[PDB]
Design an enzyme around this catalytic site. Structure first.
Site, mmCIF file in Angstrom:
data_model
loop_
_atom_site.group_PDB
_atom_site.id
_atom_site.type_symbol
_atom_site.label_atom_id
_atom_site.label_comp_id
_atom_site.label_asym_id
_atom_site.label_seq_id
_atom_site.Cartn_x
_atom_site.Cartn_y
_atom_site.Cartn_z
ATOM 1 N N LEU C 38 -9.569 121.233 -79.654
ATOM 2 C CA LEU C 38 -10.424 121.755 -80.964
ATOM 3 C C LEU C 38 -10.655 121.083 -82.215
ATOM 4 C CD1 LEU C 38 -10.051 125.543 -81.951
ATOM 5 C CD2 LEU C 38 -11.852 123.901 -82.709
ATOM 6 N N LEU C 40 -11.112 118.749 -85.031
ATOM 7 C CA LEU C 40 -10.493 119.871 -86.091
ATOM 8 C C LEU C 40 -11.380 121.347 -86.114
ATOM 9 C CD1 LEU C 40 -9.820 117.893 -89.440
ATOM 10 C CD2 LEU C 40 -8.070 118.675 -87.816
ATOM 11 N N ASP C 41 -10.880 121.909 -86.968
ATOM 12 C CA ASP C 41 -11.621 123.320 -87.153
ATOM 13 C C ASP C 41 -12.971 123.361 -87.033
ATOM 14 O OD1 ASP C 41 -12.330 125.904 -88.009
ATOM 15 O OD2 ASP C 41 -11.711 125.908 -89.974
ATOM 16 N N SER C 42 -13.843 122.356 -87.681
ATOM 17 C CA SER C 42 -15.064 122.140 -87.314
ATOM 18 C C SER C 42 -15.186 120.856 -86.448
ATOM 19 C CB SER C 42 -15.970 121.975 -88.623
ATOM 20 O OG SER C 42 -15.634 120.982 -89.327
ATOM 21 N N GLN C 45 -16.195 122.929 -81.827
ATOM 22 C CA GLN C 45 -16.821 123.952 -81.542
ATOM 23 C C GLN C 45 -18.246 124.128 -81.806
ATOM 24 O OE1 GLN C 45 -15.217 127.522 -83.516
ATOM 25 N NE2 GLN C 45 -16.233 129.128 -82.386
#
Ligand SMILES: CCCCCCCCCCCCCCCCCC(=O)OC[C@H](COP(=O)([O-])OCC(O)COP(=O)([O-])OC[C@@H](COC(=O)CCCCCCCCCCCCCCCCC)OC(=O)CCCCCCCCCCCCCCCCC)OC(=O)CCCCCCCCCCCCCCCCC
Ligand SMILES: CCCCCCCCCCCCCCCCCC(=O)OC[C@H](COP(=O)(O)OCCN)OC(=O)CCCCCCCCCCCCCCCCC
Lengths: 458, 101, 86, 114, 107, 141, 74, 167, 90, 57
Positions: C38, C40-42, C45
């Protein structure tokens, strides 16, 4: 003549005299038959019109108009059957009697031979209609439709009997139309306006001007089950023709004041059709059509100069059917879904495929495709009323636009996906749904083949 | 969409010849079909009382008749193939080729 | 009319995800849980659904982003959209 | 032109105490589907917002009306106004056209219709 | 528009020509240029602006056209020479901006 | 057969918190700015207390918008405010309030003057004065 | 049915995909590299350009021009 | 929407309107990292007002540079042939009004249907009443316990579970 | 989010279970039922055109002289090939 | 189902029928042959030339 009133009154004890449930089919069977008699001796002249008795010339006049009147009766019992099957037989015997009790006078009227049988029979209804509205309503607002339906119709039709008894003893005898062969004119005074105004305004309050129509949607929105008498009240209204018997003569030469009835209904014709676009109740939406291209005849009649009567007659019986039949659709689609709110019914046309072409041919005859009666009834209006003054082409040319957005928005509202929550609406239009919805478009378009049978003398 | 088209030849041999014939023809008819249509106008009525604007105005529109064509030619028939995979194209179609021909 | 199955969607999704040199093609395919991948956070995804739209190409709804934890979950409901396997 | 229509505005963090704006609706779609899923129904749903949609629109105004504010006496600028105008337009014609029909002949002699 | 006198028969769409309609004419060249026979001009079917010069000539053009029906070509030299009648006329009528140019200048 | 208090009654201030929401919840807390207020310019009987108006405009927008249905199809339980112009109206465009069309529609209006002239090709302009002569000027022969 | 197999393209070619070098002055680089390079290679490297696209060989023109020209021919 | 994920809805569309502007397939691809550079310029810093200028000024420079007629992904919230096929729409529960002799066909299928109903014939007594236990008062989003604690039948049966397909 | 575990993976065995029930075609599931029962193909074009061509002309040959002025056909457009000399050629 | 008669493409660039293109190419002549007679025999303009009406005498 008695060829007609006698069997149709003979109908009257064909009904109760019968047994249990056989009643409906008993009278619907016969009530069709009379239509052979309807044509039978009628559709004679033509020239030098038919008068077969002292106080009756049934219809000669080239205002045949009577054949329809005898249609709509055994279109009711196919129409009215739905929820009237839920109360008692001795009451169901009534509702078929008064409904006939109407049909008997509409044969008396349209003949009348004269003025003064017309009137007492022109007011002789409202006994049978008022009783069908108040009982067998639906909402509780009906009780006011009872009054408003009077207190107009009767309100100003008393000034007839003050005027028509004023003529009877002034010039000769009104006993007969067919003798006007002595008629002096009406020049002017502050008395004669009133005479002309008394001999007129009673008729206007039936076929509405844009004023004093305040009753028309009050009675139709809330009104009996099937439109059972709502089909009849779309005959009653147009039957204000008698203005064709008067204004042709009997004060011919006052056109002086015509203008407040022209510019008042000529700017309403462009008007009340436009206040019909945002309506949220369907039996309202049709009720305002009925004003509009009915109220066009009032600018056809006042103007003299035929090519209007060529086109004014075709209109009385133009929407006589189309405007009838729509009240027959909006009834059916209401049987299944118990709101009259237009929004609620959507996502049809998948679930009732055969009834697709029924909406269409209806909503297509307000559009008035050229070949049918509708335009050939409008394009003799525009041809004379153009010669009046060239500028009439604009407003009544606008009428031919807003009315097209008008009609479609009613159909195209029933083309959408909606499955939505309805578990109802299963019945796939059992035959009566599509049988009584026919016997309109079949006879209607048909007349265009030999359309010399709908015309005035001119 | 004129995006995601690709070039001239990927299993479209015949249909792409139909474009470049017609889409050439509409361009002012060098020897082709309407050679008597668009061509016999601006060379005939153009000698008249004309508004001296349409002459300016119309003949300029004649220009864009090229870029009309060449645009939808060059994004569809020219550039590299661009469009998602699994493209099944079959042009062998008796009930079609019979029609264009 | 074009035949569709549940194998290719396990392959295609396995495929381009194994095409990116940012991912070694020894790594898990059907279940990595994607929270290991994943980072990073963005840029993961919404980054991964940037390419996967280039092949099928329906809209990739927003609120379906948070289903993308399970690599079997992405392939899971793409069957329900295009009317896929029995 | 019609309109901005404000697809961004101020926020963050004030009015994060505003919650249960959904609890208002979430109650119903729970209850509505609690209505809408049942084995034996076969019929339409009440849906009050529609009952209060027409009945607070068609009826329930002349009851609510008052003939006071001169923005409700506005309509003389609307209802009667142009109806006088159409008289002013016509009555000049039908006359200007009439005067010529007497002195001088505008028409031809192959007009029988009319 | 040479002879401006009246018309015995009043038939317009000038079934009354001045004599035969020219484009303008004469003024001098040609004083009488001469066209074709009017009795045969509208005896056939002849549209207006087919009554200009080269009426005699173009009446023959269609003669052969009606001769070979299953044919795409009759005479491409006549249709060429149809300019040689018309082009010669039109260019002879290009001279009216030459005279008026230098005639209406100084003198 | 809804019994008592079907619709709006004589507002638009009859204890604003009593209405929304007694029934007919336009606002939750009686202030959402959905309180049955918007009787702007009253004395017009139009829109009495009305668990109703001026809630904003330009469309239900008919997109994903998928709690369940939320806009024009699928009918969420009760929000209804005003409607019936909503099936022929949408939202914000890319530019804002530029009338360059009245500019372009008048763009040719520049060439109105190009109308008062002619286009006669032969001969050229050739600045002249008294050389014009459309037909004739001097003597005939 | 396993036809969409990897270990296939992995760009070598494509002067348009040589911008990985152009961006190497910053660097990413390719990854993911071969997606837009899926069909970038193969017979898609030719893609006939201008008029030769609308000539289509100019085949019959200068060979069949005199095909009717000409047999008598006087 | 939680402040964390607010860039996603921009980060989803940002490159989206980009590609409809670029033409060559590499053009989109070549500007990827190059325009990707701007995101992480400040990668880790305040969530509040400090970095709200990454939200604040994102408004302009986006709407500015918007509407080059984007690629709409045809079957979707908008654009051509999206909702196109309604001529079927699968009116589930068309099985009511028949007058058999129209019911001779698909006998095995009529057998299967009445077997589905038994679930929905009675699943309720614990299906509905558990929703009286499950949501205490004002509960937000209304699905049951995901299993319904033993066997959901469906539970959401069948309107969402049997719903209409696409062809 | 994890929470959808026990849910909608039932749907995967529920939705795909209905759809599983859905697809059926043995035993010809159109019964139909009952009942009983190119060169020429030379009368189909004849029943097509040759019925009207008869009927339509029978309404003409018996007709054109009935109407006082029926079909209006124009003049021959005679050319100087009959009684005339040219005489030019000029 | 219907049949397998052609399989799709993973961007392996599907093959043609080999009577697909030749049967078409014969209609690449009908533009290039029918363009023959343009310049033979016709020029950019077949007209005749206006000889500058000098005789203003
Ligand atoms: C009379 C005027 C006929 C011309 C206008 C009608 C156009 C044809 C038509 O009806 O389309 C129906 C068709 C029905 O669509 P659907 O809802 O999908 O069909 C549902 C059902 O199948 C039900 O719809 P349907 O399509 O199956 O229609 C029933 C029709 C279908 O079967 C047919 O025979 C086709 C009918 C077409 C010609 C009808 C006779 C023409 C004379 O069956 C019949 O014709 C019954 C025999 C009637 C014989 C009448 C003999 C003279 C009395 O389209 C329409 O609804 C609109 C029709 C109006 C067209 C525009 C008219 C103005 C132009
Ligand atoms: C309003 C009431 C005012 C009526 C004025 C009096 C009517 C009148 O005088 O009639 C004029 C005339 C009869 O009177 P007179 O002039 O003496 O006749 C000569 C006899 N040698 O000629 C007549 O006989 C006309 C008499 C019939 C007029 C009766 C109706 C007049 C008012 C009708 C109003 C129209 C509808 C309005 C009412 C509906 C709402 C309530």
């Amino acid at each position: 003549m008695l060829k007609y009133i006698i069997p149709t009154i003979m109908l009257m004890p064909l009904t109760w005299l019968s047994k249990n449930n056989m009643i409906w089919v008993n009278s619907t069977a016969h009530s069709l038959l009379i239509s052979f008699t309807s044509l039978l001796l009628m559709n004679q002249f033509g020239d030098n019109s038919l008068n077969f008795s002292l106080l009756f010339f049934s219809d000669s006049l080239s205002t045949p108009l009577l054949i329809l009147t005898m249609w709509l009766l055994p279109l009711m019992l196919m129409a009215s059957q739905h929820h009237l099957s839920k109360e008692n037989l001795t009451r169901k015997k009534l509702f078929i009697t008064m409904l006939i009790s109407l049909q008997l006078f509409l044969i008396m009227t349209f003949t009348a031979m004269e003025l003064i049988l017309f009137y007492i029979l022109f007011e002789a209804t409202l006994v049978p209609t008022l009783i069908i509205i108040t009982r067998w309503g639906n909402q509780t607002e009906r009780l006011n439709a009872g009054l408003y339906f009077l207190f107009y119709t009767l309100a100003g039709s008393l000034p007839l009997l003050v005027a028509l008894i004023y003529i009877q003893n002034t010039v000769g005898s009104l006993n007969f139309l067919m003798l006007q062969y002595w008629v002096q004119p009406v020049h002017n005074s502050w008395s004669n306006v009133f005479m002309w105004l008394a001999c007129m305004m009673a008729f206007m309050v039936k076929m509405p001007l844009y004023g004093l129509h305040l009753w028309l949607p009050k009675a139709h929105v809330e009104a009996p089950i099937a439109g059972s008498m709502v089909l009849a009240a779309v005959l009653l209204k147009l039957g204000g023709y008698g203005m064709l018997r008067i204004t042709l003569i009997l004060n011919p030469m006052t056109d002086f004041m015509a203008y407040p009835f022209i510019m008042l209904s000529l700017w309403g014709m462009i008007m009340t059709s436009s206040i019909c676009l945002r309506q949220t109740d369907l039996k309202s939406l049709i009720a305002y059509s009925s004003v509009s291209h009915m109220a066009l005849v009032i600018v056809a009649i006042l103007i003299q100069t035929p090519w209007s009567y060529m086109g004014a007659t075709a209109l009385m019986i133009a929407h006589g059917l189309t405007s009838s039949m729509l009240f027959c659709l909006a009834n059916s689609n209401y049987e299944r879904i118990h709101s009259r709110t237009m929004i609620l019914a959507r996502g049809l046309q998948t679930l009732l495929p055969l009834m697709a072409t029924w909406w269409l041919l209806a909503s297509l005859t307000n559009l008035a495709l050229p070949p049918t009666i509708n335009l050939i009834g409008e394009l003799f209006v525009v041809m004379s009323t153009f010669s009046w003054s060239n500028i009439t082409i604009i407003l009544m040319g606008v009428n031919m636009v807003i009315t097209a957005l008008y009609s479609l928005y009613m159909l195209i509202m029933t083309q959408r996906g909606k499955y939505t929550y309805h578990i109802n609406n299963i019945s796939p239009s059992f035959t009566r749904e599509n049988a009584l919805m026919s016997l309109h478009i079949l006879p209607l378009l048909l007349l265009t083949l030999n359309p010399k049978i709908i015309l005035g003398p001119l | 969409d004129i995006r995601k088209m690709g070039g001239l030849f990927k299993a479209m041999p015949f249909t792409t010849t139909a474009l470049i014939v017609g889409s050439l023809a509409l361009t002012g008819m060098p020897f082709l079909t309407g050679f008597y249509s668009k061509d016999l106008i601006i060379e005939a009525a153009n000698t008249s009382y004309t508004n001296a604007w349409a002459l300016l105005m119309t003949l300029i529109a004649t220009s864009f008749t090229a870029i009309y064509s060449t645009r939808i030619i060059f994004f569809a028939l020219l550039g590299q193939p661009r469009f998602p995979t699994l493209v099944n194209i079959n042009e062998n179609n008796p009930l079609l080729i019979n029609s264009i021909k | 009319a074009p035949p569709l199955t549940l194998e290719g969607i396990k392959d295609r999704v396995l495929y381009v995800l194994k095409l990116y040199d940012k991912i070694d093609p020894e790594k898990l395919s059907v279940n990595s849980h994607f929270m290991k991948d994943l980072g990073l956070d963005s840029l993961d995804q919404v980054e991964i659904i940037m390419a996967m739209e280039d092949e099928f190409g329906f809209e990739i709804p927003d609120i379906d982003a948070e289903k993308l934890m399970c690599p079997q979950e992405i392939v899971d409901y793409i069957a329900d959209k295009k009317d896929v396997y029995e | 032109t019609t309109l901005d229509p404000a697809e961004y505005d101020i926020s963050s963090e004030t009015r994060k105490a505003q919650a249960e704006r959904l609890a208002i609706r979430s109650r119903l779609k729970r209850e509505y589907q609690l209505q809408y899923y049942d084995p034996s129904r076969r019929g339409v749903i009440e849906d009050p917002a529609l009952v209060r949609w027409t009945y607070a629109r068609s009826a329930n105004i002349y009851p609510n009306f008052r003939p006071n504010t001169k923005t409700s006496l506005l309509g003389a600028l609307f209802g009667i106004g142009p109806l006088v105008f159409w008289y002013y337009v016509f009555k000049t014609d039908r006359d200007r056209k009439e005067k010529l029909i007497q002195e001088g002949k505008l028409d031809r002699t192959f007009n029988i219709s009319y | 528009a040479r002879r401006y006198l009246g018309d015995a028969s009043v038939e317009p769409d000038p079934l009354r020509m001045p004599t035969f309609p020219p484009d303008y004419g004469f003024p001098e060249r040609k004083e009488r240029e001469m066209v074709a026979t009017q009795q045969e001009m509208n005896d056939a079917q002849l549209v207006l602006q087919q009554r200009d010069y080269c009426a005699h000539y173009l009446i023959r053009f269609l003669k052969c056209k009606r001769d070979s029906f299953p044919n795409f070509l009759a005479c491409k030299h006549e249709r060429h020479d149809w300019d040689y009648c018309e082009h010669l006329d039109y260019v002879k009528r290009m001279k009216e901006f030459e005279r008026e140019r230098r005639l209406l200048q100084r003198k | 057969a809804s019994h008592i208090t079907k619709d709006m009654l004589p507002g638009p201030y009859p204890k604003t918190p009593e209405e929304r929401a007694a029934a007919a919840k336009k606002y939750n807390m009686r202030v959402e700015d959905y309180e049955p207020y918007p009787d702007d310019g009253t004395g017009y009987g139009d829109y009495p207390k009305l668990p109703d108006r001026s809630q904003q405009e330009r469309d239900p927008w008919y997109d994903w918008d998928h709690p369940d249905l939320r806009l024009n199809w699928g009918e969420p339980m009760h929000w209804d405010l005003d409607m019936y112009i909503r099936n022929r109206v949408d939202t914000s465009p890319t530019p804002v309030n530029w009338n360059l069309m009245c500019k372009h529609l008048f763009g040719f209006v520049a060439f109105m003057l190009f109308m008062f002239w002619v286009g006669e090709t032969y001969p050229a302009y050739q600045p002249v004065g008294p050389k014009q002569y459309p037909y004739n000027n001097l003597y005939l022969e | 049915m396993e036809l969409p197999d990897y270990k296939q393209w992995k760009i070598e070619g494509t002067p348009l995909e040589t911008v990985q070098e152009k961006l190497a002055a910053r660097g990413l680089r390719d990854p993911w590299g071969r997606n837009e390079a899926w069909r970038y290679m193969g017979g898609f490297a030719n893609n006939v350009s201008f008029v030769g696209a609308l000539l289509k060989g100019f085949k019959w023109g200068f060979a069949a021009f005199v095909v009717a020209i000409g047999a008598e021919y006087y | 929407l939680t402040h964390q994920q607010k860039v996603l809805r921009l980060y989803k569309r940002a490159l989206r309107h980009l590609e409809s502007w670029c033409i060559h397939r590499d053009k989109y691809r070549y500007f990827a990292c190059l325009l990707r550079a701007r995101f992480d310029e400040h990668k880790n810093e305040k969530d509040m007002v400090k970095a709200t200028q990454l939200l604040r000024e994102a408004e302009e420079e986006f709407w500015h540079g918007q509407h080059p007629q984007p690629y709409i992904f045809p079957e979707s919230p908008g654009g051509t042939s999206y909702e196109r096929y309604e001529c079927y729409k699968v009116p589930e529960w068309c099985l009511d009004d028949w007058h058999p002799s129209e019911k001779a066909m698909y006998p095995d299928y009529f057998a299967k249907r009445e077997q589905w109903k038994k679930l929905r014939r009675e699943s309720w007594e614990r299906e509905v009443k558990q929703l009286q236990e499950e949501t205490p008062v004002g509960g937000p989003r209304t699905e049951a316990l995901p299993p319904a604690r033993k066997q959901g039948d469906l539970p959401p049966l069948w309107w969402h579970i049997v719903t209409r397909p696409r062809e | 989010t994890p929470e959808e575990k026990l849910r909608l993976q039932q749907l995967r065995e529920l939705r795909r279970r209905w759809l599983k029930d859905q697809e059926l075609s043995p035993r010809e599931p159109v019964l139909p039922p009952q009942r009983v029962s190119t060169y020429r193909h030379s009368i189909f074009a004849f029943t097509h055109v040759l019925i009207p061509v008869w009927i339509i002309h029978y309404y003409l040959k018996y007709h054109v002289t009935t109407k006082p002025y029926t079909i209006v056909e124009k003049k021959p457009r005679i050319f100087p090939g009959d009684t005339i000399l040219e005489t030019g050629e000029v | 189902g219907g049949g397998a008669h052609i399989e799709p493409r993973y961007r392996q660039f599907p093959q043609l029928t080999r009577s697909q293109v030749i049967q078409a190419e014969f209609f690449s002549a009908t533009m290039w042959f029918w363009i023959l007679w343009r310049f033979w025999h016709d020029s950019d303009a077949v007209l005749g030339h206006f000889p500058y009406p000098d005789p203003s005498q």
